[PDB]
Ligand SMILES: OC[C@H](O)CO[C@H]1O[C@H](CO)[C@@H](O)[C@H](O)[C@@H]1n1cc(-c2ccccc2)nn1
Ligand SMILES: [Ca+2]
């Protein structure tokens with residue numbers, strides 16, 4: 001018994017996987033569902049720091065499970081939860097700026113950026129860990 005599948009990273013009771021290929025945002029959603037997971041929804045500050053550190057160090061622009069597709073300016077996680085004010089600090093300076101219509105969120109450098117949902121990027125999936 002081990003808590004996460006091979007190649008997944010254990011952190012505080014959940015398992016995380018960063019892709020080695022790039023897809024657009026909607027195709028990334030489907031990729032996580034195909035392995036019984038979810039395009040990452042962030043629930044705590046410590047979790048955000050953990051994920052941001054990995055995107056930063058690897059120098060990979062990476063989708064998360066957050067968009068304002070349904071209502072411009074209203075950001076919502078893919079599990080339906082709203083983006084809380086305690087998370088606004090994580091947007092990069094000047095973001096979200098919707099330049100050329102940008103409705104999907106990514107890890108970019110030290111913070112978050114809104115980018116075009118049709119652009120191919122890396123992605124991170126999340127699923128709960130097994131108890132042993
Ligand atoms: O990971 C993304 C990477 O850091 C590059 O980020 C920049 O390009 C992204 C994609 O266009 C923007 O989403 C982002 O906001 C930022 N940008 C672009 C502009 C901008 C303003 C006026 C005209 C043209 C471009 N301002 N910021
Ligand atoms: Ca929009």
Ligand SMILES: [Ca+2]
Nearest residue numbers: 068098102103
């Ligand atoms: Ca937008």
Ligand SMILES: [Ca+2]
Nearest residue numbers: 097098113114
């Ligand atoms: Ca942007």
